[PDB]
Amino acid sequence: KVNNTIVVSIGQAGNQIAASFWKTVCLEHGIDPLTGQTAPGVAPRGNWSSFFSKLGGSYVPRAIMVDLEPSVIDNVKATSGSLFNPANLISRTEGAGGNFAVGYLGAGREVLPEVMSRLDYEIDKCDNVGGIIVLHAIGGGTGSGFGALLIESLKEKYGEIPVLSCAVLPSPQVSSVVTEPYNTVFALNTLRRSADACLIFDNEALFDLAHRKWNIESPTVDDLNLLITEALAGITASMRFSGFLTVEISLRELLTNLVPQPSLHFLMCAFAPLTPPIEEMIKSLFDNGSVFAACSPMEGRFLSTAVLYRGIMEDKPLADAALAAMREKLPLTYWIPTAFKIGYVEQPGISHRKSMVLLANNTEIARVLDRICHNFDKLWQRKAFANWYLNEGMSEEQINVLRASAQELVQSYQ
Amino acid sequence: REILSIHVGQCGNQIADSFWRLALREHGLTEAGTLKSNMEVFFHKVRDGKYVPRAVLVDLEPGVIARIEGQLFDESSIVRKIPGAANNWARGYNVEGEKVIDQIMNVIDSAVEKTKGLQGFLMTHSIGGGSGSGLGSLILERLRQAYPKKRIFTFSVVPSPLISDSAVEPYNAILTLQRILDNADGAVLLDNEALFRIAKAKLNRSPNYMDLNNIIALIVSSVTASLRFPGKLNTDLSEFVTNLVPFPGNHFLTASFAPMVRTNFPDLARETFAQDNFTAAIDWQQGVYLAASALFRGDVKAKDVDENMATIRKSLNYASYMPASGGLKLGYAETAPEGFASSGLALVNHTGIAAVFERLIAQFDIMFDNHAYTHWYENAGVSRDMMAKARNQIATLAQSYRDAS
Ligand SMILES: Nc1nc2c(ncn2[C@@H]2O[C@H](COP(=O)(O)CP(=O)(O)OP(=O)(O)O)[C@@H](O)[C@H]2O)c(=O)[nH]1
Ligand SMILES: Nc1nc2c(ncn2[C@@H]2O[C@H](COP(=O)(O)CP(=O)(O)OP(=O)(O)O)[C@@H](O)[C@H]2O)c(=O)[nH]1
Numbered sequence: 001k002v003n004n005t006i007v008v009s010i011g012q013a014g015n016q017i018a019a020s021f022w023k024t025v026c027l028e029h030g031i032d033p034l035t036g037q038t039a040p041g042v043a044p045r046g047n048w049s050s051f052f053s054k055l056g057g058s059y060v061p062r063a064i065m066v067d068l069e070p071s072v073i074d075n076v077k078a079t080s081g082s083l084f085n086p087a088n089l090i091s092r093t094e095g096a097g098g099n100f101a102v103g104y105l106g107a108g109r110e111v112l113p114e115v116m117s118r119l120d121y122e123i124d125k126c127d128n129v130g131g132i133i134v135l136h137a138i139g140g141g142t143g144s145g146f147g148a149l150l151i152e153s154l155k156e157k158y159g160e161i162p163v164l165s166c167a168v169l170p171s172p173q174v175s176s177v178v179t180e181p182y183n184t185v186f187a188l189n190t191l192r193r194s195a196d197a198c199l200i201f202d203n204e205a206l207f208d209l210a211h212r213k214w215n216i217e218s219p220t221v222d223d224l225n226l227l228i229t230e231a232l233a234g235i236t237a238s239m240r241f242s243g244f245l246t247v248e249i250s251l252r253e254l255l256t257n258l259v260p261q262p263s264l265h266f267l268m269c270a271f272a273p274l275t276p277p278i279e280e281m282i283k284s285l286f287d288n289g290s291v292f293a294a295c296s297p298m299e300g301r302f303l304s305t306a307v308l309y310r311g312i313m314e315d316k317p318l319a320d321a322a323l324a325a326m327r328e329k330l331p332l333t334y335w336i337p338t339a340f341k342i343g344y345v346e347q348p349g350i351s352h353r354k355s356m357v358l359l360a361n362n363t364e365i366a367r368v369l370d371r372i373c374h375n376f377d378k379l380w381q382r383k384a385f386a387n388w389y390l391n392e393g394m395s396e397e398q399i400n401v402l403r404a405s406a407q408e409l410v411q412s413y414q
Numbered sequence: 415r416e417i418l419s420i421h422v423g424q425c426g427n428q429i430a431d432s433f434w435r436l437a438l439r440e441h442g443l444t445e446a447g448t449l450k451s452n453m454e455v456f457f458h459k460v461r462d463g464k465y466v467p468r469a470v471l472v473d474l475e476p477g478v479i480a481r482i483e484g485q486l487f488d489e490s491s492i493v494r495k496i497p498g499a500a501n502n503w504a505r506g507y508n509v510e511g512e513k514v515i516d517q518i519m520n521v522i523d524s525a526v527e528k529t530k531g532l533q534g535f536l537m538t539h540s541i542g543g544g545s546g547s548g549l550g551s552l553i554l555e556r557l558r559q560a561y562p563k564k565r566i567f568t569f570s571v572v573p574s575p576l577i578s579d580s581a582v583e584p585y586n587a588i589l590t591l592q593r594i595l596d597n598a599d600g601a602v603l604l605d606n607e608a609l610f611r612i613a614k615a616k617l618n619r620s621p622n623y624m625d626l627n628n629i630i631a632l633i634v635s636s637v638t639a640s641l642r643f644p645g646k647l648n649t650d651l652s653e654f655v656t657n658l659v660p661f662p663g664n665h666f667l668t669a670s671f672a673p674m675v676r677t678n679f680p681d682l683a684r685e686t687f688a689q690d691n692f693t694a695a696i697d698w699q700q701g702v703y704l705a706a707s708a709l710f711r712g713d714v715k716a717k718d719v720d721e722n723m724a725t726i727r728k729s730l731n732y733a734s735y736m737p738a739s740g741g742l743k744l745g746y747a748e749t750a751p752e753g754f755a756s757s758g759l760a761l762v763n764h765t766g767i768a769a770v771f772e773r774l775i776a777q778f779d780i781m782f783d784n785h786a787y788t789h790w791y792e793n794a795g796v797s798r799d800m801m802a803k804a805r806n807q808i809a810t811l812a813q814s815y816r817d818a819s
Contacts, residue, residue: 012648070415071452071644093415093531097653141656174720175740176647178657178705207717218679218715221646221746375737382735384660385705 002047003130003250005239006122008064008150010103011143012072013168013225014136015065019076020222020229021135022061022083025051025240028233028350031059036083045347046241047248053125055085062122064088066115066150068107068142069095088118096141098177100186103145105393112149119150129161131239131251134195136187137168139180144187151194162255165191165198166232172294172371173204179385181375182399188369189405197255197265199235200365201228202294209289213274230349231269231292234357237310237345245313246344249306257341258304258361263412266365268293270358277351278315282322285356286330293368300364301331302339310345311354366413373406416532417455417638418525419469420553422506423546424478425571426539427471431482432627433538433634434467440635440751441465445485451749455533455642458525460488468525472518472553474499474510474545491521499545501580503589504794506548515552522557533641534565534600534651536634539590542573542583547590554597565651566598569634572770574606575695582787584777585801591771592804595663595811599655602637602667603767604630605695612691616674632751633669633693636759639711645748646716649709657743658705658763664814666767668694670760675753679715683708683722686758687730694770701766702731702819707743709759712750719744733765733819768815771808778805 009018023033029044029052031037036058038044044052044059052059063084067073073091076084092111096102123129134151136143151163167187170180177183191198206224210216216223238249249257259265269292272285284290285307288298307323323342332339349355379385380403389399421430435445441453447464457465466488471479476494483489498510505511526532535557539546550568557566570590573583580586594601609626617625640649659665670693672686685691686708689698710719723739732741743761750757781787782805788798 012646016646069648069650071641071648074452075644094533095650095652097650097656099652099656102652141653171720172739174723174726174744175737175742176744177653178736178740178743180740181737203716204720207720211717218717218721221716224716375740378735378737378740382660382733384735385657387659387662388656 001127002050002242002248003128003239003252004049004062004126005051005131005133005236005251006062006064006119006126006129007051007133007135008119009135010066010146010150011136011140012067013140014143015067015072015076017168017225017228018063018065018135019080020225021232022063023080024229024233024350025236026083029059033083034081036060036081047239049127050239051236060085062126064115064118064122066090066111066146068092068103068111068146088122090115090118096145098141098179098183099388099392100141100145100148100183101389101392101394103142104148108146108149111146112153115150116153131162131164134163134165136165138184138187139168139170139177141179141183144183148187148190152190155194162197162252163195164251164255165195166201167191167198168201168203169293169368170372171202171204181372181379182385182389184372185376185406186402188409189402192263192405192409195265197259197267199267199269200368201292205292205294209274209292215276227271227292230271230351231357233349234271234308234310234355235269235359238308238343241345241347243346246346249341249343254306258306258359260303260336263409264303264361268297268360268362268365272356273352279322281356282326285358286326291358293365295364295368297360297362297364298331300362301333303333303361303363304336304339304341306341306343306359308343308345308357308359310356311348311352313344363413366410369406370410373410376403415452415455415641416529418522418532418535419456419467420535420537421469421471422537422539422550422553423473423543425543426546427473427478427482428623429538429569429571429627429630430469430471431485432624432631434485436628436631436751437467437635440749447486451643453642455638470518470521472514472549474506474549491525493517499543501544501582501586502790502794503544503548503551503586504791504796506545507552508795511549511552514549515556518553519556519560523560532564534567536567536569536638538569538634540571541587541590542571542580544586547586551590551593554593558597565600565655567600567602567651568594568598569602569604569630570594571604571606572694575773576607582790584774585781585787585791587774588778588808589801589804592807595807598665599659600651600665600667602633602669602761603694603770605693605770608693608695612674612693629671629693632671633759635751636671636709636711636757637669637761639747639749639759640709640745643711643747643749645746647744647746649707649743649745654707654761658707658761660704660763661814661818663811664704664763664818666763668692668696668762668764668767672758673754676755679718679756680722682756682758683719684725687725687760689729692760694767696764697766697769701764701769702733703741704733704736704763704765704818705743706730706741707745707761709745709747709761710756711747712754712756714746714756716746719746765815765819768812771812775805775809775812
């Protein structure tokens with residue numbers, strides 16, 4: 001038995017990204033995602049118990065999906081079949097609709113007890129849980145509000161379990177809800193306060209990464225969630241595969257190697273190679289645009305990077321020399337010399353015979369949030385769309401405190 | 415995830431006619447309800463082939479409901495009331511409105527009592543009539559006070575600027591828009607001459623109200639497209655209220671549908687948010703957008719939708735409190751109306767719709783000071799003081815739009 005990880009997904013982006021995530025993870029283990037049962041005659045490759053459970057039996061994922069509208073959960077059910085436990089699937093009707101306060105004080109409050117009934121049911125089935133991954137978009141209302149409520153009640157009742165968040169940020173190219181600044185700042189406060197770590201995505205960055213660097217004239221959001229899924233598969237392969245040359249990395253150990261200070265726990269990620277199914281690949285991983293966020297991280301400053309290779313290793317001394325050579329021309333912080341965690345996995349991804357995933361802590365992400373904060377400067381100088389936040393239960397002073405906490409995070413980075 | 419549609423007045427009933435004429439085969443059914451993607455939000459389960467659109471066609475001086483029943487509705491919920499609508503708001507409110515409100519709300523609460531879960535109401539009417547104006551206002555009053563947690567949306571046809579079909583229609587319009595303010599959290603306004611010019615551009619011969627109401631029907635269908643056609647980036651009516659209504663009483667929307675078809679997507683998106691493609695003649699040059707919802711459906715590609723930013727950074731003019739790349743409620747639906755591989759809807763909270771309001775104000779500013787038609791209200795139970803305060807509320811709303819620029 002190995003350290004466990006429960007992935008709770010909230011909101012539309014979180015649930016669809018989770019659907020693709022366990023799709024690719026199951027087909028990495030040789031498990032059919034649309035059914036949830038293992039392939040006959042084929043053993044699960046790696047440590048399945050970290051993210052799955054033998055429910056008698058079936059290799060069911062330990063995923064909790066909640067959404068205040070039924071459409072997304074029903075779509076995930078249609079595209080995934082009997083993979084997830086219907087008990088672990090909780091749905092409401094009216095939705096939150098871009099409103100944080102609905103998921104925070106409102107429908108979120110009444111849907112919370114069943115959600116954590118399923119959650120502590122799942123965690124009681126865990127052997128030694130060392131992390132919880134919250135897959136969501138903090139731009140939306142259900143995602144932000146219930147991610148906030150869920151992580152807050154976790155860290156008040158638990159608190160020895162690390163929390164990795166995976167939040168989809170608004171695209172600077174286009175917004176999808178006009179209350180995304182509100183939801184993002186409101187959930188960013190509790191991500192700072194409650195979640196021990198957070199992973200950040202951005203849609204149009206994945207668009208430009210999958211348009212010319214995947215050979216599709218116009219990729220859909222399916223390919224964006226597929227890129228995020230490849231990122232998550234590479235990141236969690238350290239928690240999913242064991243052996244001699246490979247090193248096992250728990251989410252707590254990954255937390256320790258990625259989080260030097262309690263407030264420095266928002267992470268960037270990148271994937272290599274950027275080709276449809278070595279030194280050029282080494283620079284492909286660390287390109288200015290290869291990160292899954294709308295920024296240029298090479299003028300920022302990497303705090304600590306987890307570089308997880310997975311696949312065949314024929315030139316390990318030459319590749320270690322390549323990492324040593326590239327470290328000279330990368331922005332690294334002086335106060336953590338051991339900023340590189342070189343994780344290895346013998347088994348590669350399905351799409352590529354050899355791949356790498358970058359999971360970095362960089363200061364540039366702050367300026368990313370800053371532009372979101374800049375958007376918060378527009379909806380709050382005029383007091384717009386904030387009537388329903390007040391009506392559902394939040395307050396003027398509460399919103400001011402949450403925005404001040406987001407600014408505290410941004411100034412803690414710099 | 416359930417809709418009760420309210421249809422008061424001749425204009426609202428013809429809007430409903432076209433609305434279900436396209437909504438039925440949008441889910442693969444004929445007009446009579448025979449089978450030829452959760453479509454149960456509009457329709458109640460009655461028969462395996464007959465998915466009944468539970469929408470009340472309540473209207474004084476029925477007249478047109480006979481040709482509506484000739485396309486099968488639920489005959490029990492609808493009523494062909496004893497005539498006498500005139501164009502008097504009070505005649506649909508308290509003269510003959512008081513002798514129909516008990517029955518119509520018995521129908522409404524019988525329809526919503528058998529609902530697994532409701533999201534709100536989509537009412538189609540014309541504010542310029544007497545039945546769809548006064549009866550609609552009374553229904554709004556006794557529906558907001560009955561279900562304050564539900565979200566009423568009104569698809570109201572504002573009277574035309576160029577020519578009029580009623581001689582008391584600004585009175586009715588203002589004194590119904592006041593009730594729409596005090597009783598609903600969402601409203602899509604329709605202007606007829608904009609519909610005529612859009613149908614002139616779309617077709618090659620002279621249109622009529624049926625084409626205009628087909629356009630209105632496409633508008634209403636695409637309003638709830640992301641709610642009944644669940645794809646990616648779903649949208650809800652609660653979401654419409656949260657992200658299209660920046661201030662408590664500012665919930666009046668202007669809507670454009672495109673195209674007017676295996677068209678290239680940049681053209682579809684740039685002609686969706688076209689100043690001359692919207693279905694309400696509002697003020698664009700001096701006006702600005704408060705909250706634009708782009709609901710694209712069909713053969714839409716996510717990068718295609720998100721890369722069409724030229725029409726937003728070039729043509730769309732926003733208010734100072736909205737971010738330059740923001741102001742977009744994006745929605746994706748897997749299904750588009752037939753004849754369109756990919757289609758788009760722009761639902762904009764806009765300042766210029768106040769211009770719509772003010773033209774009615776202008777008419778009211780010349781009638782009330784001259785005691786023009788107010789005795790028709792006074793002898794019917796509606797005094798001049800309540801008309802004056804209703805116009806005061808409407809003028810305050812238009813000033814709120816002018817201050818939100
Ligand atoms: N990479 C992906 N991003 C997505 C996906 N779905 C949505 N998104 C992105 O999420 C962002 C909006 O967040 P959502 O509205 O989906 C989260 P939520 O359902 O909780 O919002 P409400 O329903 O309003 O409460 C937007 O940028 C979308 O482009 C997806 O399947 N993959
Ligand atoms: N743009 C559209 N306008 C319409 C349509 N039908 C009617 N109208 C116009 O709406 C305006 C007023 O609508 P109505 O008088 O039909 C509303 P109502 O039936 O309640 O009036 P009364 O029955 O006389 O009390 C008038 O210009 C009508 O010609 C339509 O399908 N589309």
